[PDB]
């Protein structure tokens, strides 16, 4: 990746409007999973078994309570340098903002806000996180319903149109598009790199494993984001020195 990292840094260095696209892989992490996200984290599943969704979240607490890693800081640095103008993410933990990124387009929402499906009461995550931490499943303090849904896009749910539009435009007008930690198997998000490819942007991908979209990237890197990204950023700094 020595050569690739250098090449990736060279593209970003010259770009005028780079966009980053991140997935679950940005964070390094029986055989089959006890909780199948396509079921417990699907809208049909939630409208039928809300508690299953929360039990699943609790099992993923370490990831939900994870803090920014070097990849998030590297990405925030690239924006600060004016090289990265937008970060499109499928993630819902707000780690990009928590790391310093400003223009973050959350394709799938975030845990920040929640609504009771039955009485429509809205809540802030801060109102349930302490219960959630001790294994208590959030329940509406108004009507007692277990249908307390966070404003995150579940499988089978339409993505927020406002965010989707801006993400599409960023892809349509960027001159460099870098995928970080995304296996690109979640749609419609997975279509954004292709829109950028169609736009003529230079393509870069950093992922632990190869993807079916790999063929369209100008530079491909296999590895952990948290280890790869800072390396790139450091090579970008040198390209912007005296």
């Amino acid at each position: 990746m020595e050569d690739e990292i250098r090449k990736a840094a060279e593209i970003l260095a010259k770009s005028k409007h780079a966009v980053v696209f991140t997935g679950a892989g940005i964070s390094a992490e029986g055989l089959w999973r006890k909780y199948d996200p396509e079921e417990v984290a699907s809208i049909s599943g939630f409208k039928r078994n809300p508690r299953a969704f929360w039990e699943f979240s609790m099992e993923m607490k370490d990831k939900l309570f994870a803090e920014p890693n070097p990849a998030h800081y590297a990405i925030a640095e690239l924006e600060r340098m004016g090289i990265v103008k937008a970060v499109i993410t499928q993630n819902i933990d707000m780690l990009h903002q928590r790391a310093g990124s400003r223009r973050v387009l959350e394709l799938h929402g975030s845990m920040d806000k929640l609504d009771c499906l039955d009485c429509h009461e809205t809540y802030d995550w801060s109102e349930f996180v302490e219960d959630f931490n001790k294994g208590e499943i959030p329940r509406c303090r108004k009507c007692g319903s277990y249908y307390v849904k966070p404003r995150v896009v579940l499988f089978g749910e339409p993505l927020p149109q406002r965010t989707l539009f801006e993400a599409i435009e960023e892809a349509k007008h960027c001159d460099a598009f870098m995928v970080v930690g995304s296996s690109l198997v979640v749609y419609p998000a997975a279509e954004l790199p292709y829109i950028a490819k169609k736009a003529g942007a230079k393509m870069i991908i950093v992922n632990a494993e190869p993807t079916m979209a790999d063929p369209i990237f100008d530079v491909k890197i296999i590895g952990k984001a948290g280890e790869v990204l800072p390396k790139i950023v450091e090579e970008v700094k040198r390209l912007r020195s005296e």
């Binding site: 799938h108 499988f155 089978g156 339409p158 198997v185 749609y187």
Partner: peptide
Amino acid sequence: RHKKLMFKT
């Protein structure tokens, strides 16, 4: 109208 789905080739 774009619903979230997962698909692997």
